[PDB]
Design a protein around this ligand. Structure first.
Ligand SMILES: *[C@@H]1O[C@H](CO)[C@@H](O)[C@H](O)[C@H]1NC(C)=O
Ligand SMILES: *[C@@H]1O[C@H](CO)[C@@H](O)[C@H](O)[C@H]1NC(C)=O
Lengths: 148, 34
């Protein structure tokens, strides 16, 4: 007889997690074949598992190709409003979404100094007649000039 | 740069270096970042 060529034939996503990084930016992380990530507001092909960033109420799932993982449901910030303007301080306020965040900070950068305050928030001390751009980190930057 | 972090404030200064303003009787850990 003739022995032919022996032929090789090739035949869920472990603990998918979703982290809300910014108001258009989510952080997906899953472990082990390719993956298909589906996100729906209440698909992207990836070659390897791990951490990825999804840009642009949302139910997310990851399919390993074929079964998929469990669907996770997750949830724009307002601009900074100046409540009090002083020569050595600045009290600012924002409403925000009513959701729990692990990090929420206000960063004010001037031409000579930059201060990050862990969060309404009062930034003190500041230089008099100095302009600083302030933003929210979990955003849009607003320039404010201190009093003299 | 020189970064001085206290319990309530953290200031990074672009570079000897003089860190000002700071709170009185406040401890800050300062380090050099390259
Ligand atoms: C896909 O995953 C589920 C949940 O872990 C498991 O029960 C199922 O057997 C998997 N499917 C296959 C075809 O292995
Ligand atoms: C991933 O690991 C275990 C597996 O069950 C789970 O208890 C844990 O909460 C998961 N962590 C995250 C961040 O999803």
């Amino acid at each position: 007889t003739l022995v032919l060529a022996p032929l090789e034939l090739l035949t869920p996503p472990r603990n998918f997690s979703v982290r809300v990084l910014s108001p258009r930016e989510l952080e997906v992380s899953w472990l082990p074949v390719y993956y298909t990530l589906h996100w729906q507001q209440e698909e992207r092909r990836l070659e390897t598992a791990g951490t990825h960033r999804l840009t642009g109420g949302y139910s997310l799932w990851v399919q390993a190709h074929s079964n998929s993982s469990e669907r996770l449901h997750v949830r724009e910030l307002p601009e900074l409003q100046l409540l009090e303007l002083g020569p050595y301080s600045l009290s600012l306020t924002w409403a925000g979404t009513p959701d729990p965040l692990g990090s929420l900070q206000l960063e004010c950068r001037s031409s000579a100094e930059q201060l990050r305050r862990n969060v309404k928030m009062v930034v003190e001390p500041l230089q008099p007649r100095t302009r600083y751009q302030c933003r929210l980190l979990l955003g849009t930057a607003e320039v404010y000039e201190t009093l003299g």
